[PDB]
């Protein structure tokens, strides 16, 4: 280990594979060349800082850089040639042709097994869409376990209006009240709340229906976003039904016209997709992408760490973007919390909510969604209501019937109906 | 409990999200000046 700066030459066409664990802090300063973290180019002579995530730094051109990391040494650095970037560029340029020629931009869905179609493919295409003719594609995340521009348990639609944060596993951040180096994002968020699609499939499908509706409205009113299309990420094939009925719903609600399949040529998924979606999309519009290099498999401990990181980021910001959340004390009487129907609590999960009893077992360290609906609003209104943001219930005091609530925005406690998520955060 | 108010000289904060209507009508060129 060491706290000094070390020189590294990444040859053209290679990935510098980084796996930072726990308390690992890495600073990179590029001297010459073109390097990219999922399509986002690192500016020369500018210091980039990374913490507790795994990613590849791709060398577009032979690159010389300096790096500082005590958890790394010159003799244990992993630099290996990437032979699959060709597949991504060929795809991007095909999409770029559709944005220039056609009446509207393409609406691309990414289907597959491993989450290497996520980040890797999605993020690069998004970074690349902005790179040549300044498009603003709508990035749509349908995997609620994956926190992108928000907290976990959400499905989202975010226009990629400017460069992503190469330093962050979360791609970047939503708008702030002040001044930032990078322009932040303005996402549309739908709260699923539960940890897994299986927990309430009907609710996951209502979320998609709701996001689809607003996406349509945005595309109708926004020429630039309509001219650029959509890039849609889905949950793992394993997480969905055998019939893939959920993809039919996604395709209908999101008006998908192109499908990208990530598997091997031995995988039966390819023919299944061709048979199932071909009659709707047309086979000419279904594409095969082989196993992409650079991206290494991820465990549940890494997933749990990533979920924690995004929750802190929502309230406190990133390392170079210090934000001030606001803590308030409230009486039990001042909150109206609902809980979604789920397989565990209710045997079969339906599109319905249940009132929550203010108990430390129920609400301590809980992430709560704040809706636009009034406290007195009925169940059916609450479930259809847009999300204002999130809050964290820090402490629940039983004797003096009070709660400590952390808000992202300093000011008043919103007098709105709230929804309890399966997500927890301590500190 | 513990420390109420702003947590950790000029300060900024995360903004609330827009409603469906406000979001549909929003143009990101407002962000990117």
Swiss-Prot record, chain A:
Disruption phenotype: Causes defective 3'-end formation and transcriptional read-through. ATP binds at residues 15, 54, 115-120. GO terms for molecular function: ATP binding; polynucleotide 5'-hydroxyl-kinase activity; RNA binding. Keywords: ATP-binding, mRNA processing, Nucleotide-binding, Nucleus. The keyword Nucleotide-binding applies. One of its GO terms (biological process) is mRNA 3'-end processing. This is mRNA cleavage and polyadenylation factor CLP1.
């Amino acid at each position: 280990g060491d706290n000094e700066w070390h020189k590294l030459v990444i040859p053209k066409g290679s990935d510098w594979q980084i796996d930072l664990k726990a308390e690992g802090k890495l600073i990179v300063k590029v001297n010459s060349g073109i390097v990219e973290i999922f399509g986002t180019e690192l500016a020369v002579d500018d210091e980039y800082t990374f913490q507790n995530w795994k990613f590849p730094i791709y060398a577009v051109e032979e690159t010389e850089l300096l790096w500082k990391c005590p958890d790394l040494t010159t003799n244990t650095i992993t630099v290996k040639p990437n032979h699959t970037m060709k597949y991504i560029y060929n795809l991007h340029f095909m999409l770029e042709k559709i944005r220039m020629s056609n009446f509207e931009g393409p609406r691309v869905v990414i289907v597959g097994g491993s989450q290497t179609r996520k980040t890797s493919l999605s993020r690069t295409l998004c970074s690349y869409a902005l790179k040549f003719n300044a498009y603003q594609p709508l990035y749509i995340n349908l995997d609620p376990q994956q926190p992108i521009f928000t907290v976990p348990g959400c499905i989202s639609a975010t226009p990629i209006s400017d460069i992503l944060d190469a330093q962050l596993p979360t791609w970047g951040q939503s708008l702030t009240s002040g001044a930032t180096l990078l322009h932040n994002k303005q996402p549309m968020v739908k709260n699923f709340g539960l940890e897994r699609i299986n927990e309430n499939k009907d609710l996951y499908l209502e979320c998609i229906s709701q996001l689809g509706q607003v996406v349509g409205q945005r595309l109708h009113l926004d020429p630039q976003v309509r001219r650029s299309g959509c890039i849609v990420d889905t949950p793992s094939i394993s997480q969905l039904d055998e019939n893939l009925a959920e993809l039919h719903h996604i395709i209908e609600k999101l008006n998908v016209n192109i499908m990208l399949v990530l598997c091997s040529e031995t995988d039966p998924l390819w023919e299944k997709v061709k048979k199932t979606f071909g009659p709707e999309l047309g086979n000419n519009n279904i594409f095969f992408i082989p196993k992409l290099d650079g991206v290494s498999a991820v465990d549940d401990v890494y997933k749990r760490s990533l979920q924690r990181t995004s929750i802190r980021e929502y309230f406190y910001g990133s390392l170079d973007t210090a934000l001030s959340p606001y803590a308030i004390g409230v009486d039990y009487e001042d909150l109206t919390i609902w809980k979604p129907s789920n397989v565990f609590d209710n045997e079969v999960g339906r599109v319905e909510l249940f009132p929550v009893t203010i108990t430390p077992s129920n609400l301590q360290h809980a992430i709560i969604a704040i809706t636009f609906a009034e406290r007195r609003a009925d169940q059916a209104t609450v479930i259809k209501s847009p999300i204002l943001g999130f809050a964290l219930i820090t402490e629940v005091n039983e004797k003096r019937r009070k709660l400590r609530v952390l808000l992202p925005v300093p000011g008043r406690l919103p007098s709105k109906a709230m929804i309890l998520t399966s997500y927890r955060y301590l500190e | 409990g513990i420390s109420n108010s702003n947590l950790n000289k000029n300060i900024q904060s995360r903004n609330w999200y827009l409603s469906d209507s406000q979001w549909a009508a929003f143009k990101d060129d407002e962000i990117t000046s």
